[PDB]
Design a protein around this ligand. Structure first.
Ligand SMILES: Cc1cc2nc3c(=O)[nH]c(=O)nc-3n(C[C@H](O)[C@H](O)[C@H](O)COP(=O)(O)OP(=O)(O)OC[C@H]3O[C@@H](n4cnc5c(N)ncnc54)[C@H](O)[C@@H]3O)c2cc1C
Ligand SMILES: O=C(O)c1cc(Oc2ccc(C(F)(F)F)cc2Cl)ccc1[N+](=O)[O-]
Length: 449
């Protein structure tokens, strides 16, 4: 009858909520003093600043179903007035990322032969057979070297803070690999997909717009916390589990307690879930423990109204070949004007990632100085900030590197030999908010069986 959920980030919260909304009592245990995990918005100095995540793409049904179940649909906010441009630092300046194929062919984002080579994606050679090919290898084959170096590397940085040479395209971009399987060429697949839809409606159509909530993504967290209420325990570290069924040893209020449930859902990060799995299956815990994370810091810089202009666009990204100490920045106030009061301008700068993890081990003063130097060199920002807030995440973002899918497949096969045990979270089948929520609901539905 009962389920324990371990971990209270978006995945754990969404699993417990979906179980309870279908009449399965779930208890959730969070080791921290607060729910949310990576998600957290802070009201400071006239800003709403985001701990980690800033937005979701309003294209996932599960996230809309969850907002509806939580009476949040009217609190969903779209991606700013202007602010539809993306920039990439390449060849000495911030350069606008073209949004259409005709704008791309006329653009200076890449040299002429390299743009012509992107059009030659029509003639892409077959994928290597039976090979878990990298993102960078995938790009060279489809796009050319220049487009991969600067453009695909940028896209990858904004989502995973990873290494383009190490990421599995099949794990990181399932839909690109599927289109490749069906159509070889991505351009061909798109032409054909447009033909298909243009040949022949109850619920409203999802815009795919870059979205958040009126008070940040904290609104979603506060709402899950209020929905679960007593069923979700804060400052409850799980330090053991074993068969009996399933018994959890919990450390709440500085003391030991025990809990007995029919089924356990582990929604903690790979390193923490591996620690719990070790006494049950050493080989399984090693698989789980082998999932790499990339460290990441966010440096928020607030500016008094008038001291600099409002930066155009959602933000910018910087390719690894540029050999810079910053990954990119939002443009938080341009994108979402409600997250800053009285004309104040907020940048949220991202530092670290897979290729420079050591920068995240620096102190906040040094990270703020780094962000200011880089923002000067790349964006031309000379003004002095009146606000500074640094968050460091050095358990960082899961890296779906070569061999990831076969790892997760072997993680799944080991879980079958352990009835009533289940994994969920950003480590396995999707890093983003939307993936976590969709995967969370899908597990919850399958448990009521
Ligand atoms: C800076 C950055 C920017 C991001 N931007 C975006 C973006 O804008 N869009 C997007 O879609 N995604 C974004 N993400 C990714 C996304 O936010 C995360 O993948 C997601 O929030 C992770 O949720 P989770 O529930 O799976 O894990 P977590 O949030 O890490 O939650 C796991 C929880 O389990 C707890 N725990 C660990 N051990 C125990 C224990 N033994 N007992 C009890 N509890 C335990 C931890 O305290 C933690 O709170 C971003 C991430 C980073 C950090
Ligand atoms: O969403 C992006 O792709 C984007 C992300 C940025 O910052 C990050 C946000 C989140 C992460 C994450 F998720 F990897 F932690 C990395 C970075 Cl560099 C900056 C700029 C952009 N952009 O499109 O112009």
């Amino acid at each position: 009858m009962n389920v324990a959920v371990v971990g209270g980030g978006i995945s754990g919260l969404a699993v417990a909520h979906h179980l309870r909304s279908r009449g399965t009592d779930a208890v959730l245990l969070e080791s921290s003093a607060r729910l949310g995990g990576a998600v957290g918005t802070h009201a400071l100095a006239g800003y709403l600043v985001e701990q980690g995540p800033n937005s979701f793409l309003d294209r996932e049904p599960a996230t809309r179903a969850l907002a509806a179940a939580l009476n949040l649909e009217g609190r969903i906010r779209a991606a700013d007035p202007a602010a539809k441009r993306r920039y990439v630092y390449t060849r000495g300046r911030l350069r606008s990322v073209p949004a259409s194929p005709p704008a791309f062919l006329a653009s200076d984002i890449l040299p002429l032969g390299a743009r012509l080579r992107v059009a030659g994606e029509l003639f892409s050679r077959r994928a290597p057979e039976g090979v878990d090919e990298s993102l960078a290898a995938f790009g060279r084959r489809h796009l050319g070297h220049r487009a991969t170096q600067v453009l695909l590397d940028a896209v990858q940085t904004g989502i995973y803070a990873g290494d383009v040479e190490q990421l599995s395209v099949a794990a990181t971009f399932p839909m690109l690999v599927k289109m490749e399987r069906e159509h070889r060429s991505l351009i061909l697949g798109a032409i054909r997909a447009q033909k298909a839809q243009r040949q022949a409606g109850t619920a409203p159509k999802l815009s795919g717009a870059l979205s958040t909530f009126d008070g940040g993504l904290q609104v979603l967290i506060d709402a899950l916390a209020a929905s679960l209420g007593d069923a979700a325990h804060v400052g409850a570290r799980v330090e053991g589990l074993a068969r009996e069924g399933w018994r959890l040893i919990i450390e709440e209020h500085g003391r030991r307690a025990e809990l007995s449930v029919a089924q356990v859902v582990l929604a903690a990060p790979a390193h923490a879930t591996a620690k719990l799995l070790r006494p049950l299956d050493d080989a399984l815990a090693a698989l789980v423990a082998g999932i790499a994370y990339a460290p990441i810091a966010v440096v928020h810089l607030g500016f008094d109204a008038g001291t600099l202009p409002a930066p155009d666009g959602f933000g910018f990204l910087v390719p690894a070949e540029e050999q810079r100490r910053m990954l990119g920045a939002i443009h938080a106030s341009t994108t979402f004007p409600f997250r800053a009061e009285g004309g104040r301008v907020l940048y949220s700068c991202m530092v670290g990632g897979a290729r420079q993890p050591g920068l995240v081990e620096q102190d906040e003063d040094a990270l703020a100085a780094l962000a200011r130097e880089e923002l000067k060199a790349l964006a031309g920002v000379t003004a002095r900030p009146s606000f500074t807030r640094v968050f460091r995440w050095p358990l960082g973002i899961p890296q779906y590197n070569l061999g990831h899918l076969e790892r997760v497949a072997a993680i799944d096969a080991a879980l079958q030999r352990l009835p009533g045990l289940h994994l969920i979270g950003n480590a396995y089948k999707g890093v983003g908010l939307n993936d976590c929520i969709r995967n969370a609901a899908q597990l919850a539905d399958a448990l009521v069986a």
